[PDB]
Amino acid sequence: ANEQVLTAEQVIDKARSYLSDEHIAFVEKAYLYAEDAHREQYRKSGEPYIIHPIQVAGILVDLEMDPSTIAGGFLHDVVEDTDVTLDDLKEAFSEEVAMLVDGVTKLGKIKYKSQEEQQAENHRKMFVAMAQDIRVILIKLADRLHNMRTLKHLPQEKQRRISNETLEIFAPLAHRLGISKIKWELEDTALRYLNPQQYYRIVNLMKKKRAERELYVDEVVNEVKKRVEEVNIKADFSGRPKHIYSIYRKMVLQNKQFNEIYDLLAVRILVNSIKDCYAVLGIIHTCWKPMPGRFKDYIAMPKPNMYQSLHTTVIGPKGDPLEVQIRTFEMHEIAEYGVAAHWEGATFEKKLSWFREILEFQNESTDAEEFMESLDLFSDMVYVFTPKGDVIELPSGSVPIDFSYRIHSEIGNKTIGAKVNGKMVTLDHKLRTGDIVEILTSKHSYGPSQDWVKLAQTSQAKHKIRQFFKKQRREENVEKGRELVEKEIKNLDFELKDVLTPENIQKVADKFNFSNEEDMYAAVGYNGITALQVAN
Amino acid sequence: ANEQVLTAEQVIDKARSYLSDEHIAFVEKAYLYAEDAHREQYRKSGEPYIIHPIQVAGILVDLEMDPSTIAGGFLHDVVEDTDVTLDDLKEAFSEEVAMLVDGVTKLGKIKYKSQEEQQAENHRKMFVAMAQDIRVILIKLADRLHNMRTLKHLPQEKQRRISNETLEIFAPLAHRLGISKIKWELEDTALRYLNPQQYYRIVNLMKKKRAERELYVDEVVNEVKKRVEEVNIKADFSGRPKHIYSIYRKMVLQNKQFNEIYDLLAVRILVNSIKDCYAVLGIIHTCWKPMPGRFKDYIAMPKPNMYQSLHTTVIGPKGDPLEVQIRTFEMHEIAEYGVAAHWEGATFEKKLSWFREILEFQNESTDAEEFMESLDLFSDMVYVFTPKGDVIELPSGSVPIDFSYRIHSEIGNKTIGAKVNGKMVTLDHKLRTGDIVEILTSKHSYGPSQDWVKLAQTSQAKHKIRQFFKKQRREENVEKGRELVEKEIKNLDFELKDVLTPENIQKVADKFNFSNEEDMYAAVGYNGITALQVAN
Ligand SMILES: [Mn+2]
Ligand SMILES: [Mn+2]
């Protein structure tokens, strides 16, 4: 059960799968240089020299990085391990590859610090100063990952020290950049050496219940898709296996004994848009009761490492907890491969600076690893729920009036009150995201008031209110131009015309050839003398 | 048939409908000052003095402008018409109101220019220099609108000269700012004096056919909503009456005789989102054949005056032409009341500068009033059609692979070719917006290739391709770890084990307690010696 060592041709072809011929030639020259560098110069364990740089470059290609990063990973242990120097590499390929390799070597030359967070900050500072980018950090993370994969050949004390350095520096740094695969693998492979007893205990504890958990998952997945595809929203997804080191992270927390750890490796749901995300949220909330306070909105409040999802723990099946996760495919790419997945005339000027800034804030974020509300009122769209499960979007600052007019026009016109998550609110009340809103309606009502056009936020609601008021004005002027001028014209003189009310007078009113007959009456709301002389 | 003169209390209450008490006090003080300014100082025609500023301020409130603009409209004819000077106004209220009133008066003091476009540019330059904003321009447009409304009391030559100045300067300027109501009213009321014969001819020509046109509309509206509400997308809308001066604009064009003017005052459709706009577009294209080249996308290529809609002329009912318009409610607010509808610590710094820039480009846009493709590849979402009418969104640069994977996962995996609007295209072909795409599918196919992950643009398609390749790798390693090691272990020695193939060896393979039994076979794709010794 050891994943094999890949050859160089496979890595070159997998890089060719997403690169052009020039980058392929660059990485091939780098590979040949790395081969000719350590020739007749092998490891202490007797294993060939090029296996380690080849695996580092393969892990880097697995992240699909820039060709300079892959060349540096091929040439990361060439300067101080062989006769080739830094000037040789700078003359060979470029100055940037030299910077990357020199940074990797410098971070290989580490120093002890009195404090732990301070040595983490020193490892961060070396990078940030020598490379605002992560290319050096990525190459070093690949080096450490391959070291963790081939650690069993080393003495046990060295194994434990390397695993400690990984758990205290490299794995939290990988978490800082959003690269989650490397984080999980480093954490698991470090716990395997630091505490093999707890590692295998967690493994064989997950073993017994993962069968009934697969059944729980399959059933909940089936029900979820059967109730989601009805609202005509497609979503490819699967179950999320909870990795071991997170189990130990919550396990060592004395309160969170393994039994009834409330996260129980629930299902993730990948979908196309954010509105679809919140629709799936509402559907899951309507299919099962959510546990209070167990909802986390990492979309409107993204994690500082760009993580973006939606977590909610519900009652679900027979088993009490299930913490469903919902995110989009871009959000999945981010939450999986961080900046490397994210990675214009010059696309490397603002990129590395923003990455340095996100790392300079993620240091403080790692000093307090949990929620630690960040920054905000930046989001423009709030997604509100209907009690049945439907989720509708509104501009931030929208009122329940906008909600009602978004549901239906007639439903909006006859609005009286509003209930936000079971609370009698005012129509002026602002709408947050996620809260469930239901409006009070009755056809026995005149309609809106003059204040509705002011306190509304959605343009649609304002438009419909203007339309309603204009219709009312038209009917008002028509009632005037019927009754008031039906008397005012010839109060006594039309007594015959009050006896005989024919349609020929309609025709003599049509010779004015205004827009409409209803308009023939509506114009009277302004002028009353025109039809006063043409009563003939 | 003359719309009445509104009082001051009505305008103050309508401003109160969307303002606070302080702005109401400001506009009330401005109104009282305007009343006491021209007291015992009436017009040449004998009409009271305050009617004109009151109507100007009422038109400004109808646009719901800032209180300073309404105060200036109340006080636009106070400086040079009364004893009150500019310093009096500057000491009374502020410096900004003084700037606005002085600009209005300066543009009332106009100069003749040798060229027509040059005098239009002079009228633009006076504004832009004295006010990068439109507040002065808005007050002057309201002044000119009220002058056009009360023009019948003036001599005919003065009527025609004022209407000419309106048609050559004020109406095109209102069009420059996107304010369309004022543009239409000014154009119609100017054509009424400049060419009453053609005005009333167009009126009584529209009269005869507008009945059958109302029938055509009602029927098309009914069919459209009946076929749109089925796809579960709501849209409030109505018919769009074609104003008279546009009829004359196309009529004076010798080719476009009134008969079969291809625009025939078709229906507009207001909807919530842009995706809904293009969905309505596809539905209308599937219900009736579109006329070639009669489609205009003013959403992806907005008019320089911020106009944003979607026009398409189709065959429709018995009658040959019908040019349906589709836009959102924000787009409707824009296309109706321009910048005044559009109108942060300081919200007036960038606003007026951007408005000045849009006017400095709309001058050139008015020198060539028609399409005049502007700027671009700025839009991020391309909306593609399915031949049935469904419209799906993609990121710009998406390939038909992304389209197929967006339709369905299985449909995507078995993709072979693609047809864009009836043309056999490559899967590498980039997708424009609006074109109809249909992919070729067949379950007799292995699946994607290594190039698909590269040339795809949607993250969802890349994710599904990675998943497919990983499933194939798993099954490949399982086939290996069945056959190759089923022989390689004990080629002759397991002849008994080839005779007896029981499930107890499955149990001795389960004592390794790896993840899954399928994983018990999949791990053999890397290591083949572990199960070689435990054949017992
Ligand atoms: Mn190394
Ligand atoms: Mn005036």
PDB file of N, CA and C in Angstrom, chain B residues 26-87:
ATOM      1  N   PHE B  26     -35.973  73.002   2.936  1.00  0.00           N
ATOM      2  CA  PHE B  26     -35.155  73.706   1.953  1.00  0.00           C
ATOM      3  C   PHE B  26     -35.981  74.094   0.730  1.00  0.00           C
ATOM      4  N   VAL B  27     -36.724  73.134   0.170  1.00  0.00           N
ATOM      5  CA  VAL B  27     -37.496  73.427  -1.034  1.00  0.00           C
ATOM      6  C   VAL B  27     -38.658  74.366  -0.724  1.00  0.00           C
ATOM      7  N   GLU B  28     -39.197  74.323   0.498  1.00  0.00           N
ATOM      8  CA  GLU B  28     -40.268  75.248   0.856  1.00  0.00           C
ATOM      9  C   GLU B  28     -39.746  76.673   0.987  1.00  0.00           C
ATOM     10  N   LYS B  29     -38.562  76.843   1.582  1.00  0.00           N
ATOM     11  CA  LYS B  29     -37.953  78.168   1.622  1.00  0.00           C
ATOM     12  C   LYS B  29     -37.651  78.670   0.216  1.00  0.00           C
ATOM     13  N   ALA B  30     -37.165  77.783  -0.658  1.00  0.00           N
ATOM     14  CA  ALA B  30     -36.920  78.177  -2.044  1.00  0.00           C
ATOM     15  C   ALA B  30     -38.209  78.613  -2.733  1.00  0.00           C
ATOM     16  N   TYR B  31     -39.306  77.890  -2.491  1.00  0.00           N
ATOM     17  CA  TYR B  31     -40.584  78.242  -3.100  1.00  0.00           C
ATOM     18  C   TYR B  31     -41.093  79.588  -2.593  1.00  0.00           C
ATOM     19  N   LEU B  32     -40.994  79.832  -1.284  1.00  0.00           N
ATOM     20  CA  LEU B  32     -41.435  81.116  -0.748  1.00  0.00           C
ATOM     21  C   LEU B  32     -40.572  82.259  -1.273  1.00  0.00           C
ATOM     22  N   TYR B  33     -39.266  82.020  -1.417  1.00  0.00           N
ATOM     23  CA  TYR B  33     -38.383  83.037  -1.983  1.00  0.00           C
ATOM     24  C   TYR B  33     -38.752  83.336  -3.430  1.00  0.00           C
ATOM     25  N   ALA B  34     -39.039  82.294  -4.216  1.00  0.00           N
ATOM     26  CA  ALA B  34     -39.438  82.499  -5.605  1.00  0.00           C
ATOM     27  C   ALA B  34     -40.766  83.239  -5.694  1.00  0.00           C
ATOM     28  N   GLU B  35     -41.679  82.972  -4.759  1.00  0.00           N
ATOM     29  CA  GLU B  35     -42.950  83.691  -4.739  1.00  0.00           C
ATOM     30  C   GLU B  35     -42.741  85.168  -4.431  1.00  0.00           C
ATOM     31  N   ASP B  36     -41.968  85.470  -3.386  1.00  0.00           N
ATOM     32  CA  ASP B  36     -41.731  86.861  -3.019  1.00  0.00           C
ATOM     33  C   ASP B  36     -40.798  87.581  -3.985  1.00  0.00           C
ATOM     34  N   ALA B  37     -40.138  86.859  -4.892  1.00  0.00           N
ATOM     35  CA  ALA B  37     -39.227  87.505  -5.833  1.00  0.00           C
ATOM     36  C   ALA B  37     -39.990  88.274  -6.906  1.00  0.00           C
ATOM     37  N   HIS B  38     -40.837  87.580  -7.669  1.00  0.00           N
ATOM     38  CA  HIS B  38     -41.541  88.178  -8.796  1.00  0.00           C
ATOM     39  C   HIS B  38     -42.919  88.715  -8.421  1.00  0.00           C
ATOM     40  N   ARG B  39     -43.164  88.996  -7.143  1.00  0.00           N
ATOM     41  CA  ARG B  39     -44.468  89.503  -6.739  1.00  0.00           C
ATOM     42  C   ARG B  39     -44.718  90.871  -7.364  1.00  0.00           C
ATOM     43  N   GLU B  40     -45.933  91.058  -7.887  1.00  0.00           N
ATOM     44  CA  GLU B  40     -46.293  92.239  -8.677  1.00  0.00           C
ATOM     45  C   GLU B  40     -45.391  92.393  -9.900  1.00  0.00           C
ATOM     46  N   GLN B  41     -44.962  91.268 -10.472  1.00  0.00           N
ATOM     47  CA  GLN B  41     -44.138  91.249 -11.682  1.00  0.00           C
ATOM     48  C   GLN B  41     -44.561  90.022 -12.484  1.00  0.00           C
ATOM     49  N   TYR B  42     -45.454  90.222 -13.447  1.00  0.00           N
ATOM     50  CA  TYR B  42     -46.077  89.134 -14.185  1.00  0.00           C
ATOM     51  C   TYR B  42     -45.500  89.047 -15.595  1.00  0.00           C
ATOM     52  N   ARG B  43     -45.986  88.062 -16.345  1.00  0.00           N
ATOM     53  CA  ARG B  43     -45.485  87.781 -17.680  1.00  0.00           C
ATOM     54  C   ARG B  43     -46.040  88.780 -18.693  1.00  0.00           C
ATOM     55  N   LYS B  44     -45.540  88.670 -19.926  1.00  0.00           N
ATOM     56  CA  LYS B  44     -46.051  89.496 -21.014  1.00  0.00           C
ATOM     57  C   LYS B  44     -47.476  89.106 -21.389  1.00  0.00           C
ATOM     58  N   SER B  45     -47.825  87.828 -21.241  1.00  0.00           N
ATOM     59  CA  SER B  45     -49.153  87.335 -21.582  1.00  0.00           C
ATOM     60  C   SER B  45     -50.175  87.549 -20.473  1.00  0.00           C
ATOM     61  N   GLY B  46     -49.759  88.054 -19.313  1.00  0.00           N
ATOM     62  CA  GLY B  46     -50.661  88.286 -18.207  1.00  0.00           C
ATOM     63  C   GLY B  46     -50.794  87.136 -17.233  1.00  0.00           C
ATOM     64  N   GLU B  47     -50.241  85.970 -17.553  1.00  0.00           N
ATOM     65  CA  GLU B  47     -50.302  84.837 -16.645  1.00  0.00           C
ATOM     66  C   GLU B  47     -49.433  85.107 -15.417  1.00  0.00           C
ATOM     67  N   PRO B  48     -49.812  84.570 -14.254  1.00  0.00           N
ATOM     68  CA  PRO B  48     -49.015  84.787 -13.041  1.00  0.00           C
ATOM     69  C   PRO B  48     -47.561  84.369 -13.214  1.00  0.00           C
ATOM     70  N   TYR B  49     -46.713  84.928 -12.350  1.00  0.00           N
ATOM     71  CA  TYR B  49     -45.271  84.752 -12.474  1.00  0.00           C
ATOM     72  C   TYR B  49     -44.818  83.369 -12.024  1.00  0.00           C
ATOM     73  N   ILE B  50     -45.392  82.856 -10.931  1.00  0.00           N
ATOM     74  CA  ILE B  50     -44.851  81.666 -10.277  1.00  0.00           C
ATOM     75  C   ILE B  50     -45.259  80.375 -10.963  1.00  0.00           C
ATOM     76  N   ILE B  51     -46.195  80.433 -11.913  1.00  0.00           N
ATOM     77  CA  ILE B  51     -46.642  79.221 -12.595  1.00  0.00           C
ATOM     78  C   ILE B  51     -45.475  78.538 -13.299  1.00  0.00           C
ATOM     79  N   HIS B  52     -44.637  79.319 -13.990  1.00  0.00           N
ATOM     80  CA  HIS B  52     -43.524  78.723 -14.729  1.00  0.00           C
ATOM     81  C   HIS B  52     -42.492  78.079 -13.810  1.00  0.00           C
ATOM     82  N   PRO B  53     -41.961  78.752 -12.780  1.00  0.00           N
ATOM     83  CA  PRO B  53     -41.025  78.057 -11.882  1.00  0.00           C
ATOM     84  C   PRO B  53     -41.664  76.909 -11.123  1.00  0.00           C
ATOM     85  N   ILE B  54     -42.947  77.022 -10.770  1.00  0.00           N
ATOM     86  CA  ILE B  54     -43.621  75.930 -10.074  1.00  0.00           C
ATOM     87  C   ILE B  54     -43.709  74.702 -10.969  1.00  0.00           C
ATOM     88  N   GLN B  55     -44.041  74.895 -12.249  1.00  0.00           N
ATOM     89  CA  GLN B  55     -44.113  73.758 -13.160  1.00  0.00           C
ATOM     90  C   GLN B  55     -42.731  73.182 -13.442  1.00  0.00           C
ATOM     91  N   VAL B  56     -41.707  74.037 -13.508  1.00  0.00           N
ATOM     92  CA  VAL B  56     -40.345  73.538 -13.694  1.00  0.00           C
ATOM     93  C   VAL B  56     -39.935  72.667 -12.511  1.00  0.00           C
ATOM     94  N   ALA B  57     -40.190  73.148 -11.292  1.00  0.00           N
ATOM     95  CA  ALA B  57     -39.872  72.361 -10.106  1.00  0.00           C
ATOM     96  C   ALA B  57     -40.711  71.094 -10.028  1.00  0.00           C
ATOM     97  N   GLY B  58     -41.953  71.134 -10.513  1.00  0.00           N
ATOM     98  CA  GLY B  58     -42.763  69.929 -10.538  1.00  0.00           C
ATOM     99  C   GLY B  58     -42.222  68.889 -11.500  1.00  0.00           C
ATOM    100  N   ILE B  59     -41.754  69.328 -12.669  1.00  0.00           N
ATOM    101  CA  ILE B  59     -41.128  68.404 -13.610  1.00  0.00           C
ATOM    102  C   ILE B  59     -39.833  67.847 -13.027  1.00  0.00           C
ATOM    103  N   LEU B  60     -39.097  68.669 -12.274  1.00  0.00           N
ATOM    104  CA  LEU B  60     -37.867  68.185 -11.651  1.00  0.00           C
ATOM    105  C   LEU B  60     -38.160  67.165 -10.554  1.00  0.00           C
ATOM    106  N   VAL B  61     -39.197  67.410  -9.749  1.00  0.00           N
ATOM    107  CA  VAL B  61     -39.614  66.434  -8.746  1.00  0.00           C
ATOM    108  C   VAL B  61     -40.115  65.162  -9.416  1.00  0.00           C
ATOM    109  N   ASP B  62     -40.756  65.290 -10.582  1.00  0.00           N
ATOM    110  CA  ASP B  62     -41.180  64.116 -11.337  1.00  0.00           C
ATOM    111  C   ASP B  62     -39.998  63.211 -11.665  1.00  0.00           C
ATOM    112  N   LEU B  63     -38.806  63.787 -11.822  1.00  0.00           N
ATOM    113  CA  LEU B  63     -37.586  63.011 -11.993  1.00  0.00           C
ATOM    114  C   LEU B  63     -36.919  62.659 -10.670  1.00  0.00           C
ATOM    115  N   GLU B  64     -37.404  63.213  -9.555  1.00  0.00           N
ATOM    116  CA  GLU B  64     -36.893  62.918  -8.215  1.00  0.00           C
ATOM    117  C   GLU B  64     -35.395  63.222  -8.115  1.00  0.00           C
ATOM    118  N   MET B  65     -35.067  64.499  -8.289  1.00  0.00           N
ATOM    119  CA  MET B  65     -33.683  64.940  -8.282  1.00  0.00           C
ATOM    120  C   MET B  65     -33.251  65.348  -6.875  1.00  0.00           C
ATOM    121  N   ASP B  66     -32.004  65.797  -6.765  1.00  0.00           N
ATOM    122  CA  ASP B  66     -31.500  66.308  -5.503  1.00  0.00           C
ATOM    123  C   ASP B  66     -32.228  67.600  -5.133  1.00  0.00           C
ATOM    124  N   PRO B  67     -32.320  67.915  -3.836  1.00  0.00           N
ATOM    125  CA  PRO B  67     -33.044  69.133  -3.436  1.00  0.00           C
ATOM    126  C   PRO B  67     -32.442  70.410  -3.993  1.00  0.00           C
ATOM    127  N   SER B  68     -31.129  70.436  -4.237  1.00  0.00           N
ATOM    128  CA  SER B  68     -30.511  71.624  -4.817  1.00  0.00           C
ATOM    129  C   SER B  68     -31.020  71.876  -6.231  1.00  0.00           C
ATOM    130  N   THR B  69     -31.198  70.812  -7.017  1.00  0.00           N
ATOM    131  CA  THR B  69     -31.724  70.971  -8.370  1.00  0.00           C
ATOM    132  C   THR B  69     -33.154  71.495  -8.350  1.00  0.00           C
ATOM    133  N   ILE B  70     -33.977  70.995  -7.426  1.00  0.00           N
ATOM    134  CA  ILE B  70     -35.360  71.455  -7.339  1.00  0.00           C
ATOM    135  C   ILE B  70     -35.413  72.904  -6.869  1.00  0.00           C
ATOM    136  N   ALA B  71     -34.527  73.278  -5.941  1.00  0.00           N
ATOM    137  CA  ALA B  71     -34.465  74.668  -5.500  1.00  0.00           C
ATOM    138  C   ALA B  71     -34.027  75.586  -6.634  1.00  0.00           C
ATOM    139  N   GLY B  72     -33.062  75.141  -7.442  1.00  0.00           N
ATOM    140  CA  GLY B  72     -32.653  75.929  -8.593  1.00  0.00           C
ATOM    141  C   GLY B  72     -33.757  76.065  -9.623  1.00  0.00           C
ATOM    142  N   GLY B  73     -34.499  74.983  -9.866  1.00  0.00           N
ATOM    143  CA  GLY B  73     -35.640  75.065 -10.764  1.00  0.00           C
ATOM    144  C   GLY B  73     -36.711  76.006 -10.249  1.00  0.00           C
ATOM    145  N   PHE B  74     -36.890  76.051  -8.927  1.00  0.00           N
ATOM    146  CA  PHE B  74     -37.767  77.055  -8.334  1.00  0.00           C
ATOM    147  C   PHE B  74     -37.217  78.463  -8.526  1.00  0.00           C
ATOM    148  N   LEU B  75     -35.892  78.610  -8.564  1.00  0.00           N
ATOM    149  CA  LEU B  75     -35.240  79.914  -8.590  1.00  0.00           C
ATOM    150  C   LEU B  75     -34.419  80.122  -9.859  1.00  0.00           C
ATOM    151  N   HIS B  76     -34.871  79.570 -10.988  1.00  0.00           N
ATOM    152  CA  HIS B  76     -34.081  79.654 -12.212  1.00  0.00           C
ATOM    153  C   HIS B  76     -34.257  80.990 -12.923  1.00  0.00           C
ATOM    154  N   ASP B  77     -35.412  81.632 -12.772  1.00  0.00           N
ATOM    155  CA  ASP B  77     -35.710  82.903 -13.418  1.00  0.00           C
ATOM    156  C   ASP B  77     -35.901  84.007 -12.384  1.00  0.00           C
ATOM    157  N   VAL B  78     -35.030  84.038 -11.376  1.00  0.00           N
ATOM    158  CA  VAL B  78     -35.100  85.021 -10.306  1.00  0.00           C
ATOM    159  C   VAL B  78     -34.017  86.085 -10.444  1.00  0.00           C
ATOM    160  N   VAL B  79     -32.826  85.700 -10.907  1.00  0.00           N
ATOM    161  CA  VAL B  79     -31.684  86.613 -10.902  1.00  0.00           C
ATOM    162  C   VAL B  79     -31.923  87.785 -11.847  1.00  0.00           C
ATOM    163  N   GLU B  80     -32.089  87.501 -13.136  1.00  0.00           N
ATOM    164  CA  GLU B  80     -32.183  88.559 -14.134  1.00  0.00           C
ATOM    165  C   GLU B  80     -33.607  89.028 -14.391  1.00  0.00           C
ATOM    166  N   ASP B  81     -34.611  88.362 -13.820  1.00  0.00           N
ATOM    167  CA  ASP B  81     -35.994  88.793 -13.972  1.00  0.00           C
ATOM    168  C   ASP B  81     -36.476  89.670 -12.824  1.00  0.00           C
ATOM    169  N   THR B  82     -35.795  89.642 -11.679  1.00  0.00           N
ATOM    170  CA  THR B  82     -36.194  90.451 -10.533  1.00  0.00           C
ATOM    171  C   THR B  82     -35.036  91.297 -10.020  1.00  0.00           C
ATOM    172  N   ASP B  83     -35.243  91.954  -8.879  1.00  0.00           N
ATOM    173  CA  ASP B  83     -34.189  92.732  -8.242  1.00  0.00           C
ATOM    174  C   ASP B  83     -33.179  91.853  -7.515  1.00  0.00           C
ATOM    175  N   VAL B  84     -33.547  90.610  -7.200  1.00  0.00           N
ATOM    176  CA  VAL B  84     -32.644  89.700  -6.507  1.00  0.00           C
ATOM    177  C   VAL B  84     -31.500  89.318  -7.436  1.00  0.00           C
ATOM    178  N   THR B  85     -30.275  89.377  -6.921  1.00  0.00           N
ATOM    179  CA  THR B  85     -29.069  89.119  -7.696  1.00  0.00           C
ATOM    180  C   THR B  85     -28.493  87.750  -7.342  1.00  0.00           C
ATOM    181  N   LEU B  86     -27.367  87.421  -7.981  1.00  0.00           N
ATOM    182  CA  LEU B  86     -26.708  86.144  -7.725  1.00  0.00           C
ATOM    183  C   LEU B  86     -26.105  86.099  -6.326  1.00  0.00           C
ATOM    184  N   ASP B  87     -25.541  87.217  -5.861  1.00  0.00           N
ATOM    185  CA  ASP B  87     -24.998  87.256  -4.508  1.00  0.00           C
ATOM    186  C   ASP B  87     -26.090  87.069  -3.463  1.00  0.00           C
TER     187      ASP B  87
END
